[PDB]
Subunit: 294 residues, 6 copies
């Protein structure tokens, strides 16, 4: 059993990332959705653990794929332990999550786990494909990818909960709204505001995110943003210049407007389902970020 | 229009061009001499095995900074590291999806256990290499059983779920796992490109012997730490390995493993296909 | 002062050490079969043309990260990129200066028109490569007519200023421009001039790789290899094997054989030209 | 793809036009037009030619000098790439040549050719010395500055003079203004466009560093620091301290104060020019205090 | 001509003489001369030898450690280049040997040789552990520090004692002061004249990081951060936060206060020394 | 303990595997034909000489960014620059320690003088290369006399402290020093990999000739400034050197030095071993 220290070696990058929980929005979202689903506490606890394990593991992988520098205000794990250690450690946690999903003792849990992880990797693969092949998505293509990349894990937690629930109404349209809302909110924070990532890391990554997609499509006579993204640059002045352009062509105002529409849509969709005070409060809390800047 | 799936799989499809499936086919057939798996289950198991193995190679080439595999560029040198990580991980879960089609209550548990063991072996190999702590020979062997036994044990274990043959194949699987890996360490330095294991910096069976058997020198550790592509440094380090007897020691370890495999195969009633495969693979360390 | 000019010209004189085929002069001599330009004007026109040609090669090797030209190291790998840019651009305007000595009211306007054409072709070639958008075959050919036909048209157009010859040479110049560039795309990947498949390291879309990309749209292997900007010999050999396997080299050879045949028909349409015929035939040994 | 091809080829050029600096060029045109009284149609073309050639030359210069910022903006090639900007700048050179033809003057191209050859001779000497590690004497530097800056200076004024009845010799004044503008640019760069002392990162021999090198020949630290091509702020701060301590900044201020006085003398010798005097005075605040 | 040769060879050395820290060595010379009362002619030579050897060893040490700043100035090799600074420092070593001979004492050269061998054994262990990724124990670290600092400490004092009537054993005090100076450095480097946490960029095992490594053996965080040899400010800030949280800075302050108290006790055992006490007291403001 | 000593000396011990001890012993033996040094003193002097020479090569390989020496990887390419600097410098002072055991009043003073001369030559060589000022041919030779005479004069000078042979060997040591260095300059472009001198960017005898004899070209200066490993640039510059006659000029200089060596040896009563050694070394350019 002592030889099992190997477990400590393999998990150290994972435990490092856990040194500072970001939010437990997926945990708090699970609790909010249990207002409808009324899942027995023992099953719910396992589902939350699986969900957060996969979430944190995917952040380890995502930061490697994106050449990110900070997460949750801390250096990314692979910048300390190295990329090879963190790939293996994150992937190890994927299969520890599969192991935990088996303890739910439901014939369909693994099938749902599989379905959602395939969707997550399709979303992530599209995000990477567009960025690294320098082909900006349309706004609609971006949204559809976000539903897979971000809604994927939402749908895993909620889908697993429904396996143990008598509530059989379709929650997928609301999950879709929350997935888009969460990602665009994150796209906005990364370029408009440190607290999570360092200064405009999305620009250094070269990713097409909601603000830059708007700037690219709404001013087609300029290729400035595409070229800056292609430079994969860390230069603070180029990044500051590109943020000024996004501001001047209304990309940040357009992103705030989209977020305000998504928040309003969430409230309507929650009201159509009989209400949910916990979910309303969570959406409202997440929406302070794009409302009072001055 | 669902051209997405081809984009996500292209690094995987690229790797399928590479030599190496035949030996995996012969291993399936050789073990089927005992297990006599029904063709429909056997076909699914081979597909699962091929997906997981190849996906793990895509990842391993990134973890090891390799340039060539079986004479082909590594996939991430064409498609990029971010694309290949995601594509390899996608295939892991397509492999999980396929094992579900086996329609056996224990297939997923065995899949999970074996993938966990594969990652424990890989993690130790990476930890030692990148934290500059050379393992003992016993630690290396224990790690190899995890690193190689993972998919070895998955393929055979899945076959046994559908077999009346219930004898213990694990000791033989252990011998073959050590045999394959040490033979691979030996081939790498004794003639991927020229001595790529030295560029990777990994502690392999020959360098582990040289490090421990000549403790007054830090030559090998320092060369591995350089992570160098320099051919003269590599040629220098191979000559040292030769002079302190590391290649002779590895050949002898391999000859013991070959003999043990034959002993264990006979203890299981014989297996002409496996004997011929072991004998053929053992020409690599013979003059 | 004379020593200032030697300092400024040293990268240019360095490149001139290399023995070029001077095909543009031989083409000038062949086209003079029709145009019959007095030798004094012709010598000036030839000098302008080779000056601009060699200066544009200095710039092109910088824009393309090339390592060898005509079997010698590129000038900027010896003297540095800043020195070679200024020296090459210096020669552009020395070419303008010599163009003035032709003492013809229309010489400068033609010089200007053709260099605007050269930079539009070159700019498109650079734009596609560095923005990772592969051109269609038709788009590629049209830019080649500007990039490579541009300088052909400068030499012949200047000659026509001093000629009574009234036939239209533009269709033949277009064929020779396409023929020369595709022949060069082919040599770079199939065959000294450049090092091993430098076009793949540059990441440019050339006739063979354009064919492989469009004719096998379900694979993105070539686009990705070009995007890597790699010097790895094994990746390059792999990419050449693919081009061969999907018929890209056979397709390029057939395109070249059609272009050679078209040149002969167009030369016959202008009364014949033994010198130009022999030159096209000589250049066509590169394939077959 | 119809007119959008031109937009693609011209985008690095259009990007640079966002940058402050045209106002001073406008004020220079207006100041010299006080004497030259150029008809508006010819003047408008000449200003267009000058803005094209000047900006195209800055695009090339930032590549040649490995600059990162110009007038607080990213250099064009750090956004669009070096290959794109080279071709785009050179394209603009010949669009400038095309525009020069519309002046319909037999001598316009001869002047264009002469002045662009001068520009490239100055630039080549500036690059040659820097990248071959041979520091010029002050006199060699000044002669190079007359070519490097006089090139477009003399083109603007020379083209204007082709359409003017004012035929007095402006070259001595253009030479003074050329030295004045460049040395003021060397001084501002190290004394505080570019980020912190970018000239040191470029490694160029500028007026202050030339003085320090020649006036303290028993030390080679400045040559060695320039050779480092460094972005290290501490090395740059150290080298500024050395220049200060050996009096190179005081020497540069004195040279600039002499040039300002000479400009006024040469302007008075040409009958006066309140606009040019006011521009020189405003530009000369850069090397003063009180 | 030779005059200029000497200036060429000595310029990296003369550059370093601009840097602060001359005063501390002067204050140490005078404080120990309170006991040793060295004849002025010998003392001046010894001070010169001490300054030559110390500065030369700092020139070399900055190359070995990839440092950027020393005492707020750029390291010499960042201006003149590593090859120039190596040769210049080594030249000064033997100019220091040449000057030691002018002491005209049979044992001066024997003491010089012994102490420089001492210094290089300390330096070699410091470099060996760092670059072979083997963290020393606290005891091993202290023993290495006694050699690295005792090298020049013992040379200066040993040479002074050759010409002195004071024959008491100063080695125990030199050992304490050597530990005091190095650990006070280790502390200043990470807790505040180098730029921000250069020791982390160097990857060296210093007193605070040695404590963190051994006191939390289930973590490899510090070893991995040191292995990165990073200039990333956020990683450095993270590693300083970690050191604080596991008590490494508190532990270092404790060692420093024990060393300070021991120095005072050892100084009093040697008859007192107001100058040395005041210097130790001033240096001890850095903690508590 | 003693394992510290092994740690500190490992880069030095690595270099001892390399060839070239043979030539140095042959040089010691040839000069002992005149000097007839007592065996106990001779052994210490040989030991001192090998320590200082090998330590100086460790340092030189760092200063010169070399890849190979005598067909082996340079020590710092295995152990790292920091380890090799300290180990080489450690051996310098172990060499001083061993010199003390000669028990001669003038030994350390001679040791000091010669080590200062070595560093003056080395420093000038480095100064010219890294400040991009090519020496004149005469400046180069004077620098070579310091760089090589340092250890030549140390070995021979220490021997003479214990010798009745008191004739002036310095003019001969000067010629042999030039012969050795210029021959190595010649071999490098005509041990190390392909033209490592060009990668180092140093001014050596062939490139100095090419630079001064064709002053209208800066091609060689620029190639050296690139500090390049590109084989095509190296091949280009060697062919340039051939075409402007630098290799023939270097060969002629070497044969003049060989002939002068023979005359200077005969002026000292003859020395069959030294003549035979010079003759063998002259096969390289004949
Ligand atoms: C590896 C599986 C992908 C899962 C991705 N998660 C949504 C997190 C990634 C992000 O949200 P993050 O901003 O990096 O945290 P992204 O903006 O890159 O989409
Ligand atoms: C991610 C899991 C990878 C499993 C790796 N297999 C052992 C094969 C890889 C090797 O055998 P290979 O020689 O690289 O193919 P390695 O020497 O790296 O261990
Ligand atoms: C600056 C204008 C560029 C002119 C370059 N010539 C057209 C042809 C140059 C080429 O053929 P080359 O093979 O590099 O000589 P490219 O295919 O790169 O364009
Ligand atoms: C290619 C022609 C470039 C002409 C350059 N002008 C002198 C202005 C450029 C400068 O003043 P700038 O400071 O870069 O704007 P430089 O210091 O480089 O000389
Ligand atoms: C006090 C006498 C010892 C001489 C100093 N050593 C050479 C090293 C200098 C150091 O203290 P420094 O902080 O770099 O100056 P190091 O940390 O590298 O050990
Ligand atoms: C400090 C080292 C001084 C000793 C150097 N010797 C001349 C031999 C070194 C050489 O001959 P080598 O060819 O590198 O061995 P170099 O050309 O560099 O001078
Ligand atoms: Mg991300
Ligand atoms: Mg991402
Ligand atoms: Mg591997
Ligand atoms: Mg591996
Ligand atoms: Mg292997
Ligand atoms: Mg080209
Ligand atoms: Mg090109
Ligand atoms: Mg071409
Ligand atoms: Mg500039
Ligand atoms: Mg400039
Ligand atoms: Mg300037
Ligand atoms: Mg230090
Ligand atoms: Mg140190
Ligand atoms: Mg320190
Ligand atoms: Mg050398
Ligand atoms: Mg040398
Ligand atoms: Mg040499």
């Amino acid at each position: 059993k002592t030889q099992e220290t190997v477990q400590r070696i393999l998990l150290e990058p994972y435990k490092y990332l856990l040194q500072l929980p970001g939010k437990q929005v997926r945990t708090k979202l699970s609790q909010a959705f249990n207002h409808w689903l009324k899942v027995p506490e023992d099953k719910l606890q396992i589902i939350i653990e699986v969900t957060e394990m996969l979430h944190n593991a995917s952040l380890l992988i995502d930061d490697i794929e994106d050449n990110s520098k900070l997460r949750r205000g801390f250096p990314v794990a692979h910048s300390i332990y190295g990329i090879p250690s963190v790939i293996n450690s994150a992937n190890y946690v994927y299969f520890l999550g599969l192991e935990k999903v088996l303890t739910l003792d439901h014939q369909d849990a693994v099938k749902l786990f599989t379905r959602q992880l395939l969707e997550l990797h399709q979303g992530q693969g599209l995000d990477i494909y567009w960025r690294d092949n320098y082909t900006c998505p349309t706004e609609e293509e971006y949204k559809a990818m976000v539903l897979q990349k971000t809604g994927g894990l939402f749908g895993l937690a909620v889908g697993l909960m429904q396996l143990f629930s008598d509530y059989k109404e379709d929650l997928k349209p609301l999950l879709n709204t929350l997935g888009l809302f969460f990602q665009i909110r994150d796209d906005y924070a990364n370029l408009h505001s440190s607290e999570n990532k360092s200064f405009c890391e999305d620009l250094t990554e070269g990713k097409f995110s909601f603000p830059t997609i708007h700037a690219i499509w709404s001013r087609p006579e300029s290729t400035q943003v595409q070229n800056i993204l292609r430079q994969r640059t860390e230069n603070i002045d180029i990044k500051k210049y590109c943020v000024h352009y996004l501001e001047d062509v209304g990309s940040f105002e357009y992103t705030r407007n989209t977020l305000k529409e998504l928040e309003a849509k969430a409230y309507k969709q929650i009201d159509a389902r009989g209400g949910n005070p916990e979910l309303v409060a969570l959406v409202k809390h997440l929406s302070k970020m794009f409302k009072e800047e001055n």
